[PDB]
Structure 1
Amino acid sequence: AARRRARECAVQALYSWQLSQNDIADVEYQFLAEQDVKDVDVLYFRELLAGVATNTAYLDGLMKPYLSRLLEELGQVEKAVLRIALYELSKRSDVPYKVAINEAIELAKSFGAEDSHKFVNGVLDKAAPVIRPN
């Protein structure tokens, strides 16, 4: 509710970030200004704002040859969701493959484009090597 789902409490921010292209600090500023969210540990809020570090590219660079399609064609919602889910394990190292990927599959159902989970799960099998000591 609070710890894990925290991600999907602020993927909006990510989305808006990946659409606004402004200062991420002001991004979280306007986001917390939008509503008082209590299903998120503010430490995970700081993680989400830390999810700006350039390895973002690298994590899509992680799958850059491991892609079924192009990158920009992956919608901004999928872009942000997958980018933060890989920011868990590509630079932040929060949890193993099963836990974080169950998260990335369950907490994108109220945002996906009616089929997002199939492709994110089929391409996220790259999450197995990124933590090989699974």
Structure 2
Amino acid sequence: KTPRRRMRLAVFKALFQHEFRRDEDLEQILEEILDETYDKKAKEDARRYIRGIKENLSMIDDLISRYLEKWSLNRLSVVDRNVLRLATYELLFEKDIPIEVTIDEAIEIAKRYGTENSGKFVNGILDRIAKEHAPKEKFEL
């Protein structure tokens, strides 16, 4: 019922809003965005995403940094950095989602909230990260 797309957008919001509330807890902000309009399934998925991102934040950031050919991670816009994080987390840890879906949905968040070049920017980076880091079983999907 609650679209997976909206669930993922809730995760992105938490990430975005946490950059301005760092001494608060990611999980806390998530619980603010999550209200009675989000399915049980959506609340559980979003919570998994946030816990997984927090637990793997260093590894995820270091992975993205490896594929940045221009500005460093800290120098990207808040939207671009967090889109890359979310999409990288989903590529690495969410088994049921095809690569193309993760990247396409990431591009749409980028296009909607970022700069004019955000969509192409994240597309390029995620294409490379997926090719070399998506778990092998995903290449069946």
Structure 1 length as normaliser, TM-score? 0.81
Q: Which structure exhibits the higher relative contact order, with contacts defined as CA atoms closer than 8 Å and separated by 6 or more residues?
A: 1
Once residues 74 and 94 of structure 1 are traced to their aligned partners in structure 2, the CA distance between those partners, rounded to angstroms, is 29
Indicate the RMSD between aligned Cα atoms, in angstroms: 2.4
User: 1:75-100 CA deviation, whole Å, 9 max, x = no partner?
Assistant: 11111121111111224444232121
Misfit runs of 4+, over 4 Å: none
Report if aligned partners of 1:85, 1:104 keep a CA contact under 8 Å in 2.
Answer: yes
Query: Do the aligned partners of 2:92 and 2:133 also contact (CA within 8 Å) in 1?
Result: yes
Higher helix share: 2
Report the 3-state secondary structure (helix = DSSP H, G, I; strand = E; otherwise coil) of the residue aligned with 1:87. Answer: helix
What letter is aligned with 2:12?
A: V
Query: SS where residue 114 of structure 1 aligns?
Result: coil
Whether 1:6 aligns to 2:7 is yes
Corresponding position of 2:63 = 62
Residues 16-95 of structure 1: matches in 2 within 5 Å?
16-21=17-22, 22-32=24-34, 36-38=36-38, 41-68=42-69, 69-95=71-97
CA displacement at 1:37 relative to structure 2? 4.2
**Do structure 1's residue 115 and structure 2's residue 79 form an aligned pair?**
no
In 1, Cα distance between equivalents of 2:85 and 2:79:
10
Of 119, 123, 126, the match for 1:124: 126
Residue identity over aligned pairs, in percent, reads: 36
Unaligned runs of 5+ in 1: none
8 Å Cα contact 2:88-2:126 kept in structure 1: no
TM-score (norm: length of structure 2): 0.77
Note the alpha carbon deviations across 1:94-133, whole angstroms, 9 max, x for none.
Answer: 4232121111112332211121011111111221111263
Distance between the aligned counterparts of 1:70 and 1:79, measured in 2?
10
Residue 15 of structure 1 and its aligned partner are, at CA, apart by 0.5
**Which amino acid is 1:130 matched to?**
H
